[PDB]
Structures are given as C-alpha cells and as structure tokens.
PDB file of C-alpha atoms in Angstrom:
ATOM      1  CA  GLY J   1       7.872   9.650   3.268  1.00  0.00           C
ATOM      2  CA  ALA J   2       8.780  12.316   0.170  1.00  0.00           C
ATOM      3  CA  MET J   3      12.829  12.268   0.316  1.00  0.00           C
ATOM      4  CA  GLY J   4      11.939  15.511   2.469  1.00  0.00           C
ATOM      5  CA  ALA J   5       9.335  14.858   4.529  1.00  0.00           C
ATOM      6  CA  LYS J   6       9.721  12.942   7.631  1.00  0.00           C
ATOM      7  CA  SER J   7       6.102  11.266   7.010  1.00  0.00           C
ATOM      8  CA  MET J   8       5.016  12.230  10.418  1.00  0.00           C
ATOM      9  CA  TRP J   9       3.069   8.975  11.291  1.00  0.00           C
ATOM     10  CA  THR J  10       3.910   6.603  13.373  1.00  0.00           C
ATOM     11  CA  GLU J  11       3.140   2.944  12.962  1.00  0.00           C
ATOM     12  CA  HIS J  12       1.869   0.466  16.465  1.00  0.00           C
ATOM     13  CA  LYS J  13       0.832  -2.698  17.359  1.00  0.00           C
ATOM     14  CA  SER J  14      -1.799  -3.816  19.342  1.00  0.00           C
ATOM     15  CA  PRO J  15      -1.699  -7.309  21.432  1.00  0.00           C
ATOM     16  CA  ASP J  16      -3.895  -9.230  18.583  1.00  0.00           C
ATOM     17  CA  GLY J  17      -1.256  -8.220  15.720  1.00  0.00           C
ATOM     18  CA  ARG J  18      -3.669  -5.923  14.701  1.00  0.00           C
ATOM     19  CA  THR J  19      -2.057  -1.869  13.578  1.00  0.00           C
ATOM     20  CA  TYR J  20      -2.416   1.629  13.311  1.00  0.00           C
ATOM     21  CA  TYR J  21      -1.407   4.606  12.477  1.00  0.00           C
ATOM     22  CA  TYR J  22      -0.690   7.436  14.303  1.00  0.00           C
ATOM     23  CA  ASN J  23       0.508  11.227  13.353  1.00  0.00           C
ATOM     24  CA  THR J  24       2.670  12.738  16.043  1.00  0.00           C
ATOM     25  CA  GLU J  25       2.219  16.551  14.249  1.00  0.00           C
ATOM     26  CA  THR J  26      -1.370  16.766  14.454  1.00  0.00           C
ATOM     27  CA  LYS J  27      -2.409  13.696  16.717  1.00  0.00           C
ATOM     28  CA  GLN J  28      -4.885  12.260  14.521  1.00  0.00           C
ATOM     29  CA  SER J  29      -4.734   8.499  14.726  1.00  0.00           C
ATOM     30  CA  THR J  30      -6.493   6.038  11.331  1.00  0.00           C
ATOM     31  CA  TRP J  31      -6.938   3.089  10.675  1.00  0.00           C
ATOM     32  CA  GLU J  32      -6.016   3.070   6.876  1.00  0.00           C
ATOM     33  CA  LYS J  33      -2.857   2.911   5.926  1.00  0.00           C
ATOM     34  CA  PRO J  34      -2.119   6.805   4.722  1.00  0.00           C
ATOM     35  CA  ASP J  35      -1.384   7.880   1.482  1.00  0.00           C
ATOM     36  CA  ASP J  36       1.834   9.182   2.150  1.00  0.00           C
ATOM     37  CA  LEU J  37       3.467   6.137   3.478  1.00  0.00           C
ATOM     38  CA  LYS J  38       1.844   4.014   0.124  1.00  0.00           C
ATOM     39  CA  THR J  39       5.375   4.051  -1.998  1.00  0.00           C
ATOM     40  CA  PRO J  40       4.168   5.728  -5.558  1.00  0.00           C
ATOM     41  CA  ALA J  41       3.853   1.926  -6.609  1.00  0.00           C
ATOM     42  CA  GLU J  42       1.689   0.944  -3.653  1.00  0.00           C
ATOM     43  CA  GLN J  43      -0.470   4.204  -4.665  1.00  0.00           C
ATOM     44  CA  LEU J  44      -0.695   2.726  -8.324  1.00  0.00           C
ATOM     45  CA  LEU J  45      -1.521  -0.780  -6.590  1.00  0.00           C
ATOM     46  CA  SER J  46      -4.199   1.572  -4.480  1.00  0.00           C
ATOM     47  CA  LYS J  47      -5.749   2.885  -7.826  1.00  0.00           C
ATOM     48  CA  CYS J  48      -5.927  -0.732  -9.457  1.00  0.00           C
ATOM     49  CA  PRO J  49      -8.386  -3.007  -8.850  1.00  0.00           C
ATOM     50  CA  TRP J  50      -6.581  -5.793  -6.978  1.00  0.00           C
ATOM     51  CA  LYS J  51      -4.455  -4.418  -3.965  1.00  0.00           C
ATOM     52  CA  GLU J  52      -2.116  -7.765  -1.796  1.00  0.00           C
ATOM     53  CA  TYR J  53      -2.860  -7.653   2.594  1.00  0.00           C
ATOM     54  CA  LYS J  54      -1.229  -9.471   4.934  1.00  0.00           C
ATOM     55  CA  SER J  55      -2.700 -12.641   6.829  1.00  0.00           C
ATOM     56  CA  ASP J  56      -1.888 -12.409  10.550  1.00  0.00           C
ATOM     57  CA  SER J  57      -0.149 -15.433   9.134  1.00  0.00           C
ATOM     58  CA  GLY J  58       2.299 -13.764   7.550  1.00  0.00           C
ATOM     59  CA  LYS J  59       0.765 -14.898   4.177  1.00  0.00           C
ATOM     60  CA  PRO J  60      -0.723 -12.468   1.329  1.00  0.00           C
ATOM     61  CA  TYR J  61      -3.961 -12.595  -0.208  1.00  0.00           C
ATOM     62  CA  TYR J  62      -5.595 -10.864  -2.994  1.00  0.00           C
ATOM     63  CA  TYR J  63      -9.062  -8.623  -3.051  1.00  0.00           C
ATOM     64  CA  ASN J  64     -10.185  -7.230  -6.401  1.00  0.00           C
ATOM     65  CA  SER J  65     -12.086  -3.407  -5.437  1.00  0.00           C
ATOM     66  CA  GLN J  66     -14.584  -4.313  -8.514  1.00  0.00           C
ATOM     67  CA  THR J  67     -15.679  -7.456  -8.453  1.00  0.00           C
ATOM     68  CA  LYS J  68     -15.103  -7.957  -4.932  1.00  0.00           C
ATOM     69  CA  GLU J  69     -12.670 -11.069  -5.314  1.00  0.00           C
ATOM     70  CA  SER J  70     -10.757 -12.936  -3.544  1.00  0.00           C
ATOM     71  CA  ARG J  71      -8.161 -15.428  -4.499  1.00  0.00           C
ATOM     72  CA  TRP J  72      -4.982 -16.772  -2.991  1.00  0.00           C
ATOM     73  CA  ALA J  73      -2.762 -16.779  -6.105  1.00  0.00           C
ATOM     74  CA  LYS J  74      -1.571 -13.884  -7.922  1.00  0.00           C
ATOM     75  CA  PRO J  75      -2.639 -12.256 -11.128  1.00  0.00           C
ATOM     76  CA  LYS J  76      -1.333 -10.930 -14.157  1.00  0.00           C
ATOM     77  CA  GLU J  77      -2.707  -8.363 -14.274  1.00  0.00           C
ATOM     78  CA  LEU J  78      -0.997  -6.753 -10.626  1.00  0.00           C
ATOM     79  CA  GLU J  79       2.512  -9.620 -12.319  1.00  0.00           C
ATOM     80  CA  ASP J  80       2.445  -6.349 -14.828  1.00  0.00           C
ATOM     81  CA  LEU J  81       1.779  -4.178 -12.296  1.00  0.00           C
ATOM     82  CA  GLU J  82       4.930  -6.032 -10.222  1.00  0.00           C
ATOM     83  CA  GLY J  83       6.555  -6.207 -13.220  1.00  0.00           C
ATOM     84  CA  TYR J  84       6.438  -1.848 -13.340  1.00  0.00           C
ATOM     85  CA  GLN J  85       7.364  -2.048  -9.667  1.00  0.00           C
ATOM     86  CA  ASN J  86      11.369  -2.648 -10.792  1.00  0.00           C
ATOM     87  CA  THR J  87      11.017   0.241 -12.919  1.00  0.00           C
ATOM     88  CA  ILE J  88      10.123   2.722 -11.088  1.00  0.00           C
ATOM     89  CA  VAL J  89      13.632   2.760  -9.338  1.00  0.00           C
ATOM     90  CA  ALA J  90      15.783   2.803 -12.456  1.00  0.00           C
ATOM     91  CA  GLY J  91      14.075   5.755 -14.280  1.00  0.00           C
ATOM     92  CA  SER J  92      12.496   8.198 -11.507  1.00  0.00           C
ATOM     93  CA  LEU J  93       9.490   9.324 -12.846  1.00  0.00           C
ATOM     94  CA  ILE J  94       9.310  12.195 -10.868  1.00  0.00           C
ATOM     95  CA  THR J  95      11.507  13.706 -13.132  1.00  0.00           C
ATOM     96  CA  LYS J  96       9.471  13.176 -16.454  1.00  0.00           C
ATOM     97  CA  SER J  97       8.139  16.561 -16.599  1.00  0.00           C
ATOM     98  CA  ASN J  98      12.210  16.875 -16.994  1.00  0.00           C
ATOM     99  CA  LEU J  99      14.353  16.599 -20.218  1.00  0.00           C
TER     100      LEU J  99
END
C-alpha cells in the first residue's frame, strides 16, 4: 500500500498455514513479504538487525540478522524502534521535505 497504489499483491495460505504472496498484475509468486506490503516501520525493522516473525502457534520470536541469535524476549534495541513506530502516525515523515 502507498495511499494510491493498490499494491496488487495478494496473501494466500496453504493447508499447513504456510503463506505465499501473488502479484495479480505480473502474476509473479514469491515466498517473501514484498516491500510494498511492509509498513515504513516494518521496512525500518527489516533494515535493523532484529526482525519479528510468527510461529504457527501465533507466538512471535526475534531473530538478529547479524549474529544469527534468536530469542523469545524483546531486545531493547527493538523497543526503541517500537516506540518510534508510534511516532510515524503522529508526525508525517513523508512530508519531512516540507515545512
């Protein structure tokens, strides 16, 4: 989503709960989350070494892309990101180029 584009990506779930994404325009299929369907914060999270993913139980776990470490507890580094995620919808960073 981009407040105009319809993304053109669709989410589908196979019998075992595993998900794949389908682009209705180009008919491309991918097993990874498109950047278009990542919120600015999610894109930010994707660029920081900690990322959140959901287990089939619905329980999240946190993976460090740099050190390959995995923990069930929230790292403070991401907490500072979580605080910033609240800030996005209360500031409009897309108009940071405007006074």
